[PDB]
Amino acid sequence: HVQLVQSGGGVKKIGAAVRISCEVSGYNFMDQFINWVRQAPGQGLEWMGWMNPIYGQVNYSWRFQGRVTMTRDMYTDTAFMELRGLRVDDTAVYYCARGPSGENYPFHYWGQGVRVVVSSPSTKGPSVFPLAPSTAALGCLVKDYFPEPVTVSWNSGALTSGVHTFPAVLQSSGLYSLSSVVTVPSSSLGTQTYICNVNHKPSNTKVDKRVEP
Amino acid sequence: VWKDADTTLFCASDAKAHETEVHNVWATHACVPTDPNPQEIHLENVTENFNMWKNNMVEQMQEDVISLWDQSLQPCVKLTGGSVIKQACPKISFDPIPIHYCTPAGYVILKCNDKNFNGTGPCKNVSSVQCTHGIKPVVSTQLLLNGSLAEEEIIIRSENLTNNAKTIIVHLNKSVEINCTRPSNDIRKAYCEINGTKWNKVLKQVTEKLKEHFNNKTIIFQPPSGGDLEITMHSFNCRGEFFYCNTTQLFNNTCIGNETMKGCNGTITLPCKIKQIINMWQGTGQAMYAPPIDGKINCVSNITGILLTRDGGANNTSNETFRPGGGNIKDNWRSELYKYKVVQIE
Amino acid sequence: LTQPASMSASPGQSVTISCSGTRHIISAWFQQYPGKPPKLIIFDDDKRPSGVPSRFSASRPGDTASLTISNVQPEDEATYICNTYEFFGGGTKLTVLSQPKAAPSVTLFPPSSEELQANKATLVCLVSDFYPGAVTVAWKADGSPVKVGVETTKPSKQSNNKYAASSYLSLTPEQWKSHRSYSCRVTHEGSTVEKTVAP
Ligand SMILES: *[C@@H]1O[C@H](CO)[C@@H](O)[C@H](O)[C@H]1NC(C)=O
Ligand SMILES: *[C@@H]1O[C@H](CO)[C@@H](O)[C@H](O)[C@H]1NC(C)=O
Ligand SMILES: *[C@@H]1O[C@H](CO)[C@@H](O)[C@H](O)[C@H]1NC(C)=O
Ligand SMILES: *[C@@H]1O[C@H](CO)[C@@H](O)[C@H](O)[C@H]1NC(C)=O
Ligand SMILES: *[C@@H]1O[C@H](CO)[C@@H](O)[C@H](O)[C@H]1NC(C)=O
Ligand SMILES: *[C@@H]1O[C@H](CO)[C@@H](O)[C@H](O)[C@H]1NC(C)=O
Ligand SMILES: *[C@@H]1O[C@H](CO)[C@@H](O)[C@H](O)[C@H]1NC(C)=O
Ligand SMILES: *[C@@H]1O[C@H](CO)[C@@H](O)[C@H](O)[C@H]1NC(C)=O
Ligand SMILES: *[C@@H]1O[C@H](CO)[C@@H](O)[C@H](O)[C@H]1NC(C)=O
Ligand SMILES: *[C@@H]1O[C@H](CO)[C@@H](O)[C@H](O)[C@H]1NC(C)=O
Ligand SMILES: [Cl-]
Ligand SMILES: [Mg+2]
Ligand SMILES: [Mg+2]
Secondary structure, eight states: OOEEEEOOOEEEOSBSOOEEEEEEESSOTTSSOEEEEEEOTTSOEEEEEEEETTTTEEEEOTTTTTTEEEEEETTTTEEEEEEOSBOSTTOEEEEEEEOSSSOOOSOOEEOOOEEEEEOOSSOBOOEEEEEOOOOOEEEEEEEEEBSSOOEEEETTTTOOTTEEEOOOEEOTTSOEEEEEEEEOOGGGTTTSOEEEEEEETTTTEEEEEEEOO | OOEEOOOOOEEEEOOOTTOOOHHHHHHHHHSEEOOSSOOEEEOTTOOEEEETTSOTHHHHHHHHHHHHHHHHOOOSEEEETTEEEEOOOOOOOOOOOOBEEEOOTTEEEEEEOOTTOOSEEEESSEEEESBOOOBOOOOBSSEEESOOOOSSSOEEEESOTTSTTSOEEEEEEEEEEEEEEEOOOOTTEEEEEEOHHHHHHHHHHHHHHHHHHTTTOEEEEOOOOOOOHHHHTEEEEETTEEEEEOOSGGGOTTTTSSOOSOSOSSOEEEEEEEOSEEEOSSSSSEEEOOOOOSSOEEEEEEEEEEEEEEOOSSOOSSEEEEEEOOSOHHHHHHHHHTTEEEEEOO | OBOOSOOBOOTTSEEEEEEEOOTTOOOEEEEEOTTSOOEEEEETTTBOOTTSOTTEEEEOSSSEEEEEEESOOGGGOEEEEEEETTEEOOOEEEBOOOSOOBOOEEEEEOOOHHHHHTTOEEEEEEEEEEBSSOEEEEEEETTEEOOTTEEEEEEEEOTTSSEEEEEEEEEOHHHHHHOSOEEEEEEETTEEEEEEEOO
16 A cells, blocks of 8 residues: 655745655655656646655756755655745646656656645736727736736626636736636627726725726 | 576685684685686577576675675664664774675576677677686775776666666776875875876767767766765775765866867876765664774775766757766676576576 | 647547657556546556556557557546656547537737737737637747747636637737737637737
């Protein structure tokens, strides 16, 4: 019954550093390497390096050597990985893994994965802009906010058919941004106005934005 | 005719029984005096398959060496998992001595005689023998000292070079002397002098060998990425003292480069320190020994092999990077046991 | 390496996913349910561990290692990855075909005048009401695609229960003015639909 888990992830600022510990049970730690693999959100796997816990044999990937350091503790049976100097792209899920008895590859055993969210330092309220129609789908755009989430409503919630709130995205600046859309029939415009109510609670940003061609 | 098999081996030596040297005191009761008339029989018209990496003699040896060290070297204080052992640590005279191994009846050793045999696969020039060649139980990291040399070409051995996690052994056909010295009268400071010219020449030849084995890509040598000193530095025992040696200068990528006449080619001197606090290679734990003895301490040893680990990982570029190996000493033993395989006939 | 991104096959039939570029070095195959750590389901070309059925098979006769799955089941909706040592493929997200294949409704929203006077420029590409949720999005300027400033989120379920997504570009108003044509091109299992807008 090979068991092994991670207890080190979380949400971190820009740059800084983070520590991840991976405990094992079911065999002698001294035998078998440990490997670290990162999964970008909705993207393939990337191997970052491995460690032999006997004396501390580490092997790093060229993309990461100089940034990450892998360490160990025999008596507590726990491997560690520290990612000093992380960027936005490092937002991912991290796995510690091992292979069969004797040899390292392939990775039969995977821990549990842990989330790591590479954030921005500042709490920033968003900027709200219209999204004019061309039937006749329209909406509002919120740009450069932190933290998450943000509430968006339509005609003070009076209009619910055709609405859709899309998932937010971290940009390269580490700032979230999202958009919400509504379709409405082409002849209704110029007759009934449209207003989106955006509430970014942590920055106390409650705005109501118009929609006009 | 015969079937490959493993079994219990018995060692032979020639150490004088009156000597106080620890290897001799151990061998005089662990091993039998050497055969003065050893015979090897060339096996005609047979090709035999070998695998240096799965071959019990290295495991048995390792057991013998660990027994030797446990019996001989006595640390002042030993730290095992939840255990402290205090014991006197008298100074001892230390010098590796070569030993042979031999099989009892029913069992023989097949030895490959091919010059460019790489530790695995088929061999055409095969002979049979009862006993091995002289092997010095030296313990070393990143470097293979006082060993045997290759005969025709610098040979690259690995269980699989494709796997990044498998150590790579480099067998040299020209040994390089390293002269480490603690001067008499900071008692832990020491240094090793290595001839730059030969070092860089054999280094370039090795680099060309790696290029041949790896699609002529750009070979880079770098210091180790991390770990305890026993691996991040170069660990050995000389006169009972544990030396750790900074080998950063030995992987200079420019001295092999085409920068013409530069500050290379001189006698490179690398720093070293004697440490009483070491991490035992026999088993997990720490060992504290007495301070180093007084007077000149010196060891001149012939580096005969190189231990390496390749970084690897999403290469898709012009280069392959390598860093010095070490750690498991069964590989150090395999470096000389690659030629031999035990076989049953009955 | 060389792996398809998203296949599809109705329950009961057979499907084959091939990862190429192995460099002739064995093969491993992993099944991933998005959100959780993966789980290898075969090892060493033509062997598989316990806990999985004989519905799965594979073969590595050389540069391309293929993986065959018959009798599609609802947990067969997963991302399948080829492995070679420290190498992993792009992963193929295979999903079931309940609901009817739906073409993507594509719209593009130019930057607002408020954004221009704020010295900023962002063009928003909206894709909705499509299924499966596997769309290849590309931003294109004048005549060539451009990779800077683009960010795409993966699709999800809207009120009508199929899939919808969004994409963004973040550029300067000056270049938006300078060029005369900006195109969002989205591919929906190989049906390409495009929309282009000018200043
Ligand atoms: C060695 O074997 C080959 C073929 O196996 C044969 O042609 C040759 O005559 C043999 N030589 C001797 C000396 O037996
Ligand atoms: C095999 O090697 C030994 C020494 O390495 C040599 O004396 C012998 O002639 C070789 N055998 C053949 C057939 O070349
Ligand atoms: C040692 O082998 C290398 C190639 O592996 C070769 O270039 C060199 O000449 C050899 N040296 C001797 C002394 O045989
Ligand atoms: C060793 O040689 C055998 C056959 O002679 C070959 O299959 C194997 O790949 C070689 N390995 C190395 C590390 O050269
Ligand atoms: C080794 O170095 C010491 C001190 O520099 C010197 O006395 C000794 O002669 C050297 N030995 C050799 C073989 O160079
Ligand atoms: C080091 O090697 C070069 C290579 O030929 C040699 O000429 C020189 O004598 C060596 N160093 C010393 C101190 O002898
Ligand atoms: C070896 O020396 C170099 C340069 O003095 C240094 O950067 C490196 O850290 C040293 N090695 C170790 C293991 O400390
Ligand atoms: C490498 O060699 C050059 C010239 O021989 C020297 O200037 C440089 O300091 C060396 N680098 C190291 C790390 O020893
Ligand atoms: C290697 O052998 C020489 C002479 O045989 C000896 O002086 C030296 O101490 C040996 N190396 C080690 C590490 O003991
Ligand atoms: C090395 O790996 C290759 C990968 O295809 C495999 O075919 C070969 O059997 C392996 N060799 C050893 C000695 O494990
Ligand atoms: Cl010390
Ligand atoms: Mg014995
Ligand atoms: Mg001290």
